């Protein structure tokens, strides 16, 4: 429901 971008 709450996306997360990539850490790089």
């Amino acid at each position: 429901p709450y996306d997360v971008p990539d850490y790089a």
Partner: antibody
Amino acid sequence: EVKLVESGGDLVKPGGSLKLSCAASGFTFSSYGMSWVRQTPDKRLEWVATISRGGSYTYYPDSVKGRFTISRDNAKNTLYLQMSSLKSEDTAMYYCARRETYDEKGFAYWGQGTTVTVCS
Amino acid sequence: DIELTQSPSSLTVTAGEKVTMSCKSSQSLLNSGNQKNYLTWYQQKPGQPPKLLIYWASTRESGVPDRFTGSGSGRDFTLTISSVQAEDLAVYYCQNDNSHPLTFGAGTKLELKA
């Protein structure tokens, strides 16, 4: 047990297209981003695409931007790679891999690989 | 774009020998937030996917014996096998895992002496 299975490789002519698949099991698929990484015949490793766990973020190197699209069906536990405008240079073993959204440690889980050959 | 240089390209080794591998990065791999090196080492046997060996430059992964040591920081990294064994014969790759685009070194190949 975490398992990943690529499929969809084929031999194709330049300028063709192709869609790869990756079946995922053994973990909560919608909790992890995913990546595609290929190994060209000179055995170099080349990162090709990454997608966030929810699908709204995508990343590509300049070499496949505008040609490759990464996508995911979280209800089906499947990751995809659409490849357009294929060049001979795109010949490689393509690997499906889990993005370690929580460990941030690199690539721990890879599939067995599916071979794409674009003819020269 | 971050370039990783692995040296030497290939190494002929006898059993029990110590092995030293070099991975040099054109930019620092020191993460802004946690100040760990986002440098990952892989070991690849033929017909197999690369297998994760060391992460954060120096943390061994499960199942990896203490024969292996990753070391170095920022831009100059080293993989050391104190005493090479047959099951260690493989190609070793380092990976920038810190900033896009993700990039890999060309690999250092271990081969047994004829």
